[PDB]
Symmetry: C3
């Protein structure tokens, strides 16, 4: 899976460890091995949410499978809780787009996974 | 809805107010209130279009519903018009990918819209 | 078509000429003009793969058609080979998500392709 976070919080506010904690927390939550988790954090972005420029985040989680109604609620609880606790971004200024990717549409290692 | 613009136009060429103009022009054309609209603008990118590095932009609009061929041509004329009057990017060097998100695949506020 | 690469390799490590190369190699592999190809490379990113900060990349290829089993396998050989020879990223630390876009969902020149 891959998790991307874009945020107007500044770089010096993302705590050491934050990527490694999202890696291990996502491997538990998705049940995928940690070796296939990628995390990407992009601070200091020019963003607005609900018309204001208070701290906010736009995120994406792509996974082959493990995407659905209850699971994505669970991911939002986990990921909005870490973005509030670690980055101090209120949950109601976070969006997370979830994508259930087909294996034939994810390249890795020179081939795809179908 | 969430609108993202990535462009090779430099930061200082992106005028103040441009994220509020896209917020209020999206809430009028999508019909969704500004509370739900997030906008993210990323200047100074390394990007080419048709092979050349004149001004260009790659953008995405994600929304739960309100996405279709004729709606998307309305959004394309309004957003290409703001990118050409504000950022002076030619409309034929702009791509906008539109995504109709299922509510269960959008997280917000620690849960999801399903 | 549009190809985006996000990677933690530094900007000075990207060959000057790498976007032109990717334009021309994605016009020979998708079979599409280089006028409608857009390429975007984002170095120096905060990202991890398998929980370590060794060189990695998260990419996307979007195209109207030309996207499917065989073609995605071919693009994964071509583009994993390019990022390993040019940016020295190991193919097992690259993800490429492939998106077959409906023509009605791609805006360009103030309209959509359908």
């Amino acid at each position: 899976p891959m998790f991307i976070v874009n945020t107007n919080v500044p770089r010096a506010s993302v705590p050491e460890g934050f990527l490694s904690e999202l890696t291990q927390q996502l491997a538990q939550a998705t049940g995928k091995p940690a070796q296939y988790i990628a995390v990407h954090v992009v601070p200091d972005q020019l963003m607005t949410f609900s018309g204001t420029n208070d701290p906010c985040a736009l995120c994406s989680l792509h996974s082959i499978g493990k995407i659905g109604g209850a699971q994505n609620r669970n991911y939002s609880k986990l990921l909005c809780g870490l973005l509030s606790d670690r980055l101090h971004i209120s949950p109601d200024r976070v969006y997370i787009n979830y994508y259930d990717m087909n294996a034939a549409n994810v390249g890795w290692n020179g081939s795809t996974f179908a």
